[PDB]
């Protein structure tokens, strides 16, 4: 279903697409200030030297070479912000591949929605894409519950899970799957009386 899912909508690969459009449109904006006037007489360099006073031309080119350098100074500052944003995700990506892939992570809602089982990395241009194989429950039923039990004048607490009654006979089962068993001392431990 994934191969149909990744090509049905353009929003699946929109994050890596947005990465390459910011670096593309940064250079598209960058070349456009070369033709900018910046309050001078021309954008071509030889037109200043054609008729003006050469001391006045160097003053005229000073206000133009600072305007061109300020567009480059702004560009280096804008990449430094963007380099810190990707590094915040690259260190997250290295955290993901060292926990979700090389092991099982008990962090809830980190390596996938719901309970997480394993993962798979795949290579993409300028990034990485995961296949987080998770484990999510389904249809359920509701029962009547008691927090404990007492038989020989003495309270018994479950070793694991919770006591579950279907209406006539009690059962003990696992906390995340319906699997009823009969109540046995192997399934419980005793602590004090039941008063």
């Amino acid at each position: 279903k994934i191969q149909d899912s990744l090509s049905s909508t353009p929003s699946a690969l929109g994050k890596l697409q947005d990465v390459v459009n910011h670096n593309a449109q940064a250079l598209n904006t960058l070349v456009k200030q070369l033709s900018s006037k910046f309050g001078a007489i021309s954008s071509v360099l030889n037109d200043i030297f054609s008729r003006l006073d050469p001391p006045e031309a160097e003053v005229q080119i000073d206000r133009l070479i600072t305007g061109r350098l300020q567009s480059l100074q702004t560009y280096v500052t804008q990449q430094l912000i963007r380099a810190a944003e990707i590094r915040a995700s690259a260190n997250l990506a290295a955290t993901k591949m060292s926990e979700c892939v090389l092991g099982q992570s008990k962090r809830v809602d980190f390596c996938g929605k719901g309970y997480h089982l394993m993962s798979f990395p795949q290579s993409a241009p300028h990034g990485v894409v995961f296949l987080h194989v998770t484990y999510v429950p389904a249809q359920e039923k509701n029962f009547t519950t008691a927090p404990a039990i007492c038989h020989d004048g003495k309270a018994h607490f479950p070793r694991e899970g919770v006591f579950v009654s279907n209406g006539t006979h009690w059962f003990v089962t696992q906390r995340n799957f319906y699997e009823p068993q009969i109540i046995t001392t192997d399934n419980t431990f005793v602590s004090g009386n039941c008063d």
Binding site: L6, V20, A93, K113, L117, V129, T145
Partner: protein, 183 residues
């Protein structure tokens, strides 16, 4: 132009009181807001109006060509008064008397009607109201649908245990690197 001052605001009446020698009022943020008329020594008031952003709530180009022009923050009991030549820098002087308007917290929008259903949001607008495209094709505006109000059958004796499971493969996408550039 009061005594050599420049400004293009309205002239209303204010309840503030000047000293007999304190002639020109001011505020914290260094703005002109009060003057004294030479001929009559009553107290005046200055404020400018109005300015704000203009947005084009539009669907895709291949879908249709109709629009929904939004006015940010401006009370639109004022913009149909301002229908005049050489007053509206936007060209559509006839659009101020158009379709049925609906008033939001961020300002009313002109060109879209209102509906009172609970639909999901496609194009966010702000302050709990947003637009979409619906069917007789026109742009609408409605309230956020935050999901169905699912109930909880909570009691002091009731557990809920699933009896089955579905393994799903969820896909998330993370960037790693960036195109290297040298200048």
């Amino acid at each position: 132009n009061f005594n050599g001052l420049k400004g293009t605001g309205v002239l209303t009446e204010s309840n503030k009181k000047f000293l007999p020698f304190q002639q020109f009022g001011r505020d914290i943020a260094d703005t002109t807001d009060a003057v004294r008329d030479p001929q009559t020594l009553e107290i005046l008031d200055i404020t400018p109006c109005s300015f704000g952003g203009v947005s084009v709530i539009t669907p895709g180009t291949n879908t249709s060509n109709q629009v929904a022009v939004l006015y940010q923050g401006v009370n639109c009991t004022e913009v149909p008064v301002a229908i005049h030549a050489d007053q509206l820098t936007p060209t559509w002087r006839v659009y101020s008397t158009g379709s049925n308007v609906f008033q939001t917290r961020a300002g009313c929008l002109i060109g879209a009607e209102y509906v009172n259903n609970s639909y999901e949001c496609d194009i966010p607008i702000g302050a709990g109201i947003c637009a979409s495209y619906q069917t007789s094709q026109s742009i609408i505006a409605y309230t956020m649908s935050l999901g169905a109000e699912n109930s909880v059958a909570y009691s002091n004796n009731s557990i809920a245990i699933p009896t089955n499971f579905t393994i799903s493969v969820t896909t998330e996408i993370l960037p790693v690197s960036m195109t290297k550039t040298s200048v």
